[PDB]
Amino acid sequence: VSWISWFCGLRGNEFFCEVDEDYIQDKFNLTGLNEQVPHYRQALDMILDLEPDNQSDLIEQAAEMLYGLIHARYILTNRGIAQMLEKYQQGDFGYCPRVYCENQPMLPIGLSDIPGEAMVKLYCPKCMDVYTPKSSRHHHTDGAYFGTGFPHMLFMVHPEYRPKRPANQFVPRLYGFKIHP
Amino acid sequence: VSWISWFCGLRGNEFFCEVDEDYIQDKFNLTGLNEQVPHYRQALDMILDLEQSDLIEQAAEMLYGLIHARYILTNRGIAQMLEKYQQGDFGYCPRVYCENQPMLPIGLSDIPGEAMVKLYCPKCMDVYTPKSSRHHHTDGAYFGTGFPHMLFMVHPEYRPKRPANQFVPRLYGFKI
Ligand SMILES: [Zn+2]
Ligand SMILES: [Zn+2]
């Protein structure tokens, strides 16, 4: 088992995909992450199952953070997008709660690209609005681990997947009478 | 425990309120329900606790449910519901920018067996599907289509201030 497969397999991390480590091997992708997560190299090795080095517990955390931040970049590359598109087709991220979006499958998104500013939310292509995950096992995931441009990039590479707009809409009525507004 | 209290207490019936039986005693409220639910009077007694055809029940629920939809249009009903609203009994709007605005139960139709009860957001003014599954077997008709409105059109002070914020898509800090 890889550190990564283990992570992505944990409960609450259903929204993540396994980042190809080739991507991680290209130092050019990790630009500026070093000046962002504590124990950078120590955490980077841990993610790569490389040599460790006394509560080396706080490391796993920075490994999460690091992994998380890398993920946000990865899913902008075609492979990442492909892996995510697959989880999309599997409904891994849930479906739009809005009644008239008829369970349109959602995509994970971040309200900010800066860490620790907001927990990952859910985007609906149909709606084009963002919602809060119904599960709580997802109320501790940083939106920054997904970013703000991911959902868009995906659809701006796979347009055939964009949904047809809602054939129906909510129409308020008191007794069969359309109330306005 | 009274049948009604028993019912409203079951799991999955958190959205219901206890209908004052005085209301039930006025035959004028039950107009046309008799030609809608099977074993009408048998089911009506059961609801009032009056002394495998455990179907006399399936209809008690239906009947109760249909009565409920009417009840919550009366001030008492509205009051009891408004209370459950203040308690968040119906959940909050999933929409991120509605900042957990508490919702109200609603029906997409007043006709039975046509759609399961959905959730209305005053802020949003849109309807959503309950996140729990224990609510995916409740008829919207037991709540009706005009209830949320009636409530707010009697308790305006409760209408929410519109969203101070909105979703703004961006690729890299760039509104797109
Ligand atoms: Zn939607
Ligand atoms: Zn709302």
Resolution, angstroms, 1 dp = 3.1
Asked if the domains at B1-91 and B92-151 fall in one CATH topology, the answer is: no
Centre of ligand 1 from the C-alpha of residue B54, in Å: 41
Select the residue of A97, A172, A176 nearest B149 (Cβ to Cβ).
Answer: A172
- Closest C-alpha to A44, from A84, A4, A78: A4
HSE (CB half, 13 Å, CA atoms) of A80? 22
Select the residue of B96, B118, B170 nearest A130 (Cβ to Cβ).
Answer: B96
Q: Are A106 and A121 in contact (CB under 8 A)?
A: no
Backbone conformation region of residue A50, classed left if phi is above 0, alpha if psi is from -120 to 50, else beta:
beta
CB-based contact A148 B126, cutoff 8 Å: no
DSSP string covering A39-55:
THHHHHHHHTT------
Write B77-83 long-range contacts (CB < 8 A, 24+).
B77/B17, B77/B19, B78/B150, B78/B151, B78/B154, B78/B155, B80/B17, B80/B18, B81/B17, B81/B147, B81/B151, B82/B151, B82/B155, B82/B158
Quote the CA–CA distance of B105 and B12 in Å, as a whole number: 13
CATH number for the domain whose boundaries are B92-151: 2.20.25.20
Of chain B residues 79-108, which have a CB less than 8 A from chain A? Answer: 94-97, 108
Taking the domains of chain B in order of start, what are their residue ranges?
1-91, 92-151
Quote the CA–CA distance of A10 and A3 in Å, as a whole number: 11
What is the identity of the amino acid at B156? Answer: P
B128 at interface of A, judged by CB pairs closer than 8 A: yes
Fold of A95-154: N-terminal domain of TfIIb (2.20.25)
- Residues with Cβ–ion distance below 5 A, ligand 1: A 96, 98, 101, 104, 124, 126-127
Quote the CA–CA distance of A57 and A63 in Å, as a whole number: 10
Q: SS3 breakdown of chain A: % helix, strand, coil, rounded to 5?
A: 35, 10, 55
Domain spanning B1-91: CATH 1.10.1820.10? yes
- Closest C-alpha to B108, from B147, B72, B74, B70: B147
The SS3 call for residue A31 is coil
CATH number for the domain whose boundaries are A1-94: 1.10.1820.10
Local structure of residue B164 (DSSP, 8 states): S
